[PDB]
């Protein structure tokens, strides 16, 4: 049964990845075909840029503002900055905004989504001047709603670009993220690429390639059928028409009789999906964000994301009937995402309980081969040799995403720490206990048996491969070869500041 299980797991994990690669290539081909027909100096869409932030890094916030102002798009209405502030510690961002754009920081005493008159004209009069609002701290959804209302009060605005306060945009990011809206009339949202620039630590270095894979391959596969499940927070274009009709249900959201304060962009893309509309993904709109370098902060972030995913997967599954064919792909992806977690958990439990050295070695070898193939494709697509670091993302997944998923599932059905990391510590202790039990139960040496020789040689080779990859990473870190070209210049400017 071990051979059947391992072969089934390998075919299940691969194959789908190959199909996703093919679909992403087709989506990129279609995007290139659309772009090649674009006229030069095309600015037919009038957009408004909305930025929402809460106590951001003043250096990175200034970099984001300057990257927005240094864009080469010829049709920009104005910049709408919303700060979840109104307090003394939050004027440090208003000062940055005044340094970059102007002294138009309006400070209303009310949150627009909690007032009787939610029209944007209640807190702003002139629609031509770039605006900054210092709103009382409620959340990201409230700041986004205020930005939506300030953008929709201009009758000439057709679309909106949503970026984070730590997102550094390329010069053509806005154009490349708003162009696909004008190709198909049924397209209402576009998702750009998000790239990790602080690839200096090992965790961030692995998360950068996880981001690359998850955006490019997966979102391209989704965009071939125009059913992208989540629009990236750091960069996303929305139609004002869909915004004006999904902003209220998305802001007055209650799940199991309580307010929802996570998955702000996942729920927005969901609301777009459940109305039968289409979302695409463009690899040519690129914005740079960063990743957590600490494991525990990453675990909290992944717990939040897993909570959002658990909340939204049922609505995504239930809204698949109004897409017809190519909505079958959405349901298949949802079922695959559901089944993958249980497949990994069951495989780990079965292999651990039945302490067979052949099964363990075969499983680790198959997993290593699969991630080697995936990293080879990633290196081919990115034209970068550092994409082979992705072979070590299995450790990050096993030790961070499974605890986060289990914690989110348990939450959705001293105590503050026990509600965040108790399950993670239990999982780590269980993995250590399983390893110790296997080592103790398989404590013998027999070089006259070719099966024992095979198992020992395989496990030793896997350990040597992991050590070689780690040594290569350390060498690259010492010489700063792992540094993203944006990271080097960011460090250089921050030194002179």
């Amino acid at each position: 049964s071990a051979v059947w299980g391992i072969s089934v797991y390998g075919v299940f994990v691969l194959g789908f990845y190959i199909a996703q690669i093919v679909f992403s290539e087709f989506n990129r081909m279609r995007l290139s075909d659309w772009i090649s027909l674009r006229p030069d100096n095309w600015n037919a869409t009038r957009v408004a840029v909305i930025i929402a932030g809460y106590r951001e890094d003043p250096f990175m916030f200034k970099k984001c503002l300057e990257s927005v102002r240094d864009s080469e798009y010829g049709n920009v209405a104005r910049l709408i900055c919303v700060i979840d502030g109104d307090e003394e510690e939050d004027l440090k961002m208003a000062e940055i905004y005044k340094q970059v754009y102007n002294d138009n920081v309006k400070k209303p005493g009310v949150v627009l989504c909690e007032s009787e008159n939610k029209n944007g004209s209640t807190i702003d009069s002139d629609v031509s001047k770039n605006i900054c609002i210092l709103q009382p701290h409620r959340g990201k959804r409230e700041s986004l709603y205020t930005g939506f209302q300030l953008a929709s009060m201009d009758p000439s605005v057709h679309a909106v670009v949503l970026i984070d306060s730590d997102t550094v945009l390329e010069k053509n990011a806005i154009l490349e993220v708003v162009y696909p809206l004008s190709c198909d009339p049924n397209i209402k949202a576009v998702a750009g690429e998000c790239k990790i620039w602080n690839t200096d630590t090992i965790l961030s270095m692995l998360v950068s390639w996880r981001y690359f894979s998850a955006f490019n391959v997966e979102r391209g596969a989704q965009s071939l059928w125009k059913t992208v499940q989540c629009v990236g927070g750091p960069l996303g274009a929305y139609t004002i028409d869909i915004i004006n009709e999904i902003k209220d249900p998305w802001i007055t959201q209650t799940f199991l009789g309580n307010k929802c304060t996570y998955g702000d962009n996942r729920r927005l893309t969901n609301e777009v999906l459940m109305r039968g509309k289409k979302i695409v993904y463009t690899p040519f709109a690129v914005g740079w964000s960063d990743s957590p370098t600490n494991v525990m902060r990453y675990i909290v972030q992944q717990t939040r994301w897993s909570k959002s995913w658990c909340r939204e997967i049922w609505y995504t599954l239930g809204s698949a009937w109004k897409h017809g064919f190519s909505g079958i792909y959405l349901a298949f992806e949802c079922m695959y995402q559901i089944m993958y977690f249980f497949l990994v958990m069951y495989l780990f439990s079965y292999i651990a309980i039945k302490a067979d050295i052949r099964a363990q070695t075969a499983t680790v070898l198959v997993s290593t081969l699969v991630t080697i193939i995936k990293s080879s494709y990633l290196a081919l697509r990115a034209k970068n040799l550092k994409a082979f670091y992705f072979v070590l993302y299995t450790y990050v997944y096993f030790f961070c995403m499974i605890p986060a998923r289990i914690t989110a599932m348990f939450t959705m059905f001293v105590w503050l720490w026990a509600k965040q990391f108790l399950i993670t510590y239990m999982w780590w202790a269980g993995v250590l206990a399983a390893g110790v039990y296997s080592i103790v139960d398989n404590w013998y040496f027999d070089w006259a048996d070719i099966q024992y020789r095979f198992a020992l040689v395989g496990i030793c080779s896997y350990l040597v491969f992991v050590s070689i990859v780690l040594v290569i990473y350390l060498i690259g870190k010492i010489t700063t070869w792992n540094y993203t070209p944006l990271q080097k210049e960011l460090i250089e400017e921050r030194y002179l500041h």
Partner: nanobody
Amino acid sequence: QVQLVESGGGLVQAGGSLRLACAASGRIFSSDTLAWFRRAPGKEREFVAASRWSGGGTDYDSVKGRFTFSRDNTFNTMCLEMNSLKPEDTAVYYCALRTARDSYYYTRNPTGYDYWGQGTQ
């Protein structure tokens, strides 16, 4: 932040071409609007040309065809090439910059340009 210096002020007897150069010190964003204005003796500042640090090169006024506006972001300078100069086309040429800081709206009003250069010819 930005200092504009003009060069190329010569004498043309209404039968030759001329080139004017504007060099800018300080960071210029791609959303800024750079313009050439004209001020004749006993005459106000009249618009001549304008464009962005990216492209578009519109609003050539009534001198369309004669004058060409070409930028160079690598050298942080731009130029205006003048062809078929006329006796009426003698004045002092000004280099002006407008920031998208307050608003992104495009205007030809000289009051909207917050950075100016020196004279020329």
